[PDB]
Amino acid sequence: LLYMRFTENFERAKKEALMSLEIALRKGEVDEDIIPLLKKINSIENYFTTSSCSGRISVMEMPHFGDKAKWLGKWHREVSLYEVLEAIKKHRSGQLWFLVRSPILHVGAKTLEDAVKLVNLAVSCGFKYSNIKSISNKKLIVEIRSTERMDVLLGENGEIFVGEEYLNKIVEIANDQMRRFKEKLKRLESKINALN
Amino acid sequence: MLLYMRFTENFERAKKEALMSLEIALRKGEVDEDIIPLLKKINSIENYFTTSSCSGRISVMEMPAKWLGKWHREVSLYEVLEAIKKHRSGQLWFLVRSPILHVGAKTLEDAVKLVNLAVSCGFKYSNIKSILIVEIRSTERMDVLLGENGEIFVGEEYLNKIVEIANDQMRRFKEKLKRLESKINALNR
Least CA distance to B165: which residue of chain A? Predict the structure, then answer.
């Protein structure tokens, strides 16, 4: 590690990140929910954004938990029991899981001080799992993430273990968590202005 | 002020206090035996010291939290079932948590070298935390909804499967801890 090299390389790193975002947007590959937030972060002089996401609910099958797998259903919105049931109907092999995951934002910072300021702001907005993920000679990345999540086993190798009542309760909680993620992202967007 | 050569403020005093806290924890057996080797190795390195740390854990809890059961080892189905029977209100969850270590470091270079090594050993969520300190953490976390407001939604067969998967994670945790401990010597100069 070369001290202060990421600061020296910041202008370059930001320009490259902006080009990547510009194309991603025009290609319709960015979760629309957080497009406003990403544009806002990039409008602040000492930061830029890299690959990010706004939260997800998924019905997927994998050999063993943690070994991320095949997505039968993937949503970054709240879902209905119908949508989930349609995904479940496709289950054939491995462990079938219903997963809820927090949004994840990766942000480059010009200095260590800028990074710590952002981490502290993110935590204040409800993203307790925010921190400095990496420091290299090219850039310093801050990761913003929340603690909410769910991992429910739905079946294994074609067999389904749950019924409609339990599935209804799981979807209810899942949608509550998704609602919280969306609320926290909007809160962060409104407060990042303080970074100036 | 953030100083690269003074990453963890008052390192000397902090390490002296941390070593004192570890001595007490060891004597009362309040230290997860699974992480003892690693903790001792990290503190033997001049540029580091460990603080609030823990090994992987399985628990049953309810929140609107109240812990109904807590274990730092592979659990049995029956001890988990008994914990679940204590559920009365709120959301009932079965949780699996990765071991977590907090490490102080003399310089930023020391902190980054440790994060990079930990990540290479399987602790992908290792990072630099603002309180600055290094946090070492893995990814095999689990949060399973089991019931709500006194009503359990799952049966014993289902719980047995969850317990088996949880124990599989705990074994994976032990494996990663051994790999990290066997490589931590590289940080010495």
Answer: A65
